[PDB]
């Protein structure tokens, strides 16, 4: 029967990835994409020899097939390859909302069915679980996604947006596909779309890593010095072994006060290093050990490597040490208490973080997920004993800064090598820059301009911000680095709010600009304003419910979402300057979109080799843009002394303080307002 030869570039891509232990990405376009993933999965099974791959299916609301055996038989009541595919492969189905469940486990291949509902939180969690040479497949079934893809390739500046929400993140995702090396766009027929500009050159590698070579050497060299050597034997990556040895040398110190810190990102073995470190203490004469975490369920991998490290070096399951489990329905299966009596009596007990008492007789106490514990509680746990601290990457930095200033011995290590896949993966590197989950290690110092006098606020354009041009990308990276360096909790979803959420505006103050400059001016401070009321938010409802004021709610106002200044320039008053300028703008003291494509004109557009349409400017002066009239200004923040002084100096009057403190920070949210109705609220 007639058979269609497919481009070898598909098979070349798969074969190289499994050999290099690096993931690859596929974008299937068309409504029949569910058929294509079947063929793509089968090619993956041919390449990999370890085992049959596992498949992760993520959907938003609706799935075409039943996924239940008995229901699908009745529904059918002549042969389809897809129906066989579902019954054959070991598929784990998850929701977009319920993506937290699949955080820990590992899957061979990941399928993202619904493109339009993609969220930065979703992308980080699903791709991380893909391991080795596995595939990440994203489908474009909806007709809207096809024509959005169609418009951008013909003209980079031209974009198609129906009617509300612009949705720049999806456009940025489409544009970012070209930069990825291991990305291959495909049709419902097994046919490549040639847009990556690395696709044509793709070739097979001829038939072992630098960091791995030392780890084999360290595993051989440390056989002389053991029980240290046995611990690094159980290690999988080199960086864990370096963390293990620096842990045990801190243990061997004859010093009452010493601190060793783990600064490890997700995907890098972090609980594994702690688990071997605990076993190393048990191998030594340490007797009283305490482990602290927000929940006992959170630490399950920790005790496993303690269980694993014990198994390597004697410590039979019942002859030497005995485990005491939770014995409770809530927080089940957690081993709070473990006792090892081989060498005199040694016991390890999990305790609540709010247990400064019961810590009088402690030798080693280890804190886990230290960022999740309220900061004052951490200080109580320091004590006069040895402390191990592990905090996940992606205030704690100030606390270790105080420790570095000191008394306590300080040891710092960071984990940079992923357990699941090999370092240098194109998929991971592409994902990080797209999500902007990385910050520059070194920031160049610049001259300080006069603080209260000669700084002018500017209006940043949202549309030309997110267009993937190099100049906009760098300023995008600069502003977020200042934006995420704030004390405010950082989530990757914050990008989508700046990108998609309406009634949100970005304002930045810049140094006094001479005529001739370099590519990009330095940014000192940025303020994000969300417009509320007449022109649905925390402020309109909380005020209305508590004070029962009918006239309120018919007024027009905005709130400050985030205000931040560069850490080096902090404390000299750039923030106060921005607030004063913004008030003049909204009071009216200052004297007062990219080309959309018609629905029927999507096909009418032809290729424009050199872009001609003028892009809107990045930053606009306040005088150029008209201003809305805002009656009041508001702020909502967790009440802290340093901000309490600041906002009072800015003229904001507190109107509400929340009764119950936040669980993570132990801070009560405070709402302040500034514009006689304020006086009534204040009394």
């Amino acid at each position: 029967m007639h058979r269609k030869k497919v481009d070898n570039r598909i098979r070349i891509l798969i074969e190289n990835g499994v050999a290099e232990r690096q993931r690859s990405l596929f974008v299937v376009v068309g409504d029949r994409g569910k058929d294509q993933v079947v063929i793509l999965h089968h090619m993956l099974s041919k390449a990999t020899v370890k085992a049959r791959p596992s498949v992760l299916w993520c959907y938003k609301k609706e799935l075409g097939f039943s996924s239940h055996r008995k229901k699908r038989m009745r529904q059918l009541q002549q042969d389809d390859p897809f129906e066989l595919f579902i019954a054959a492969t070991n598929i784990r189905y998850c929701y977009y909302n319920e993506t937290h469940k699949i955080l820990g486990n590992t899957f061979g291949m990941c399928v993202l069915q619904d493109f339009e509902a993609l969220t930065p939180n979703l992308l980080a969690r699903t791709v991380e679980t893909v391991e080795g040479g596995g595939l990440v497949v994203i489908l474009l079934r909806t007709m809207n996604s096809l024509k959005q893809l169609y418009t951008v390739t013909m003209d980079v500046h031209s974009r198609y947006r129906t009617e509300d929400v612009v949705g720049r993140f999806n456009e940025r995702f489409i544009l970012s596909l070209a930069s990825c090396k291991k990305c291959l766009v495909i049709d419902d027929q097994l046919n490549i779309l040639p847009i990556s500009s690395h696709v044509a050159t793709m070739e097979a590698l001829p038939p072992l890593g630098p960091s791995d070579l030392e780890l084999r050497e360290l595993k051989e060299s440390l056989q002389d010095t053991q029980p240290v050597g046995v611990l690094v034997d159980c290690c999988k990556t080199l960086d864990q072994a370096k963390a293990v040895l620096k842990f045990i040398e801190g243990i061997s110190e004859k010093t009452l006060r010493s601190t060793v810190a783990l600064t490890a990102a997700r995907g890098r073995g972090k609980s594994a290093a702690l688990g071997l470190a605990i076993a190393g203490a048990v191998a030594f004469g340490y007797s009283n050990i305490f482990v602290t975490s927000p929940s006992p369920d959170n630490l399950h991998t920790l005790f496993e490597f303690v269980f694993k490290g014990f198994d390597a070096l004697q410590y039979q399951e019942h002859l030497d040490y005995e485990i005491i489990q939770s014995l409770n329905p809530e927080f089940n299966k957690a081993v709070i208490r473990v006792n090892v009596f081989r060498e005199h009596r040694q016991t390890i007990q999990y305790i609540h973080p709010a247990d400064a008492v019961k810590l009088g007789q402690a030798e080693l106490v280890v804190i886990d997920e230290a960022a999740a514990i309220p900061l004052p509680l951490v200080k109580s746990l320091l004590g006069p004993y040895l402390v191990f601290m592990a905090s996940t990457i992606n205030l704690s930095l100030k606390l270790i800064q105080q420790l570095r200033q000191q008394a306590r011995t300080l040891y710092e290590v960071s984990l940079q090598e992923s357990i699941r896949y090999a370092p240098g993966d194109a998929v991971e590197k592409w994902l990080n820059d797209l999500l902007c989950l990385d910050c520059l290690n070194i920031t160049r110092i610049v001259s300080g301009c006069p603080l209260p006098e000669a700084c002018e606020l500017y209006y940043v354009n949202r549309d030309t911000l997110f267009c993937y041009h190099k100049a906009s990308e760098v300023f995008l990276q600069r502003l977020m680095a200042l934006y995420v360096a704030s004390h405010y909790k950082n989530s990757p979803n914050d990008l989508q709010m700046l990108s998609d959420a309406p009634a949100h505006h970005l304002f930045c103050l810049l140094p006094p600009v001479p005529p001739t400059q370099n590519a990009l001016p330095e940014v000192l401070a940025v303020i994000q304003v969300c417009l509320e009321g007449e022109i649905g938010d925390l402020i309109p409802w909380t005020v209305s419910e508590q004070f029962q004021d009918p006239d309120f709610g018919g007024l027009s106002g905005g709130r400050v979402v985030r205000i931040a200044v560069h850490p080096d320039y902090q404390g000299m008053g750039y923030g106060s300057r921005a607030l004063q300028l913004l008030q003049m703008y909204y009071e009216g003291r200052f004297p007062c979109e990219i080309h959309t494509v018609s629905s029927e004109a999507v096909s009418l557009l032809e290729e424009v080799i050199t872009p001609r349409k003028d892009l809107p400017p990045l930053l606009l002066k306040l005088n150029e843009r008209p201003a809305e009239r805002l009656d009041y200004l508001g702020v909502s923040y967790g009440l802290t002394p340093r901000l309490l002084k600041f906002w009072k100096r800015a003229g904001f009057v507190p109107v509400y303080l929340r009764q119950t403190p936040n669980d993570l920070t132990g801070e009560h949210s405070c709402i302040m307002l500034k514009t006689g109705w304020l006086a009534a609220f204040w009394k």
Partner: protein
């Protein structure tokens, strides 16, 4: 698998998508931006 090639057993827009003389990366290079509403284009 025959060790050399692989054999296995709306559309107008994709046919246009297949036939693109300039890749999107090449399109990106020509693009330029203007800051302060008047300046030398950075691109």
């Amino acid at each position: 698998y025959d060790k050399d090639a692989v054999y296995v057993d709306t559309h107008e827009l994709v046919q246009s998508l297949i036939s693109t003389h300039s890749t999107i990366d090449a399109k990106m290079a020509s693009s330029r931006v203007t800051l302060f509403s008047d300046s030398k284009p950075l691109g």
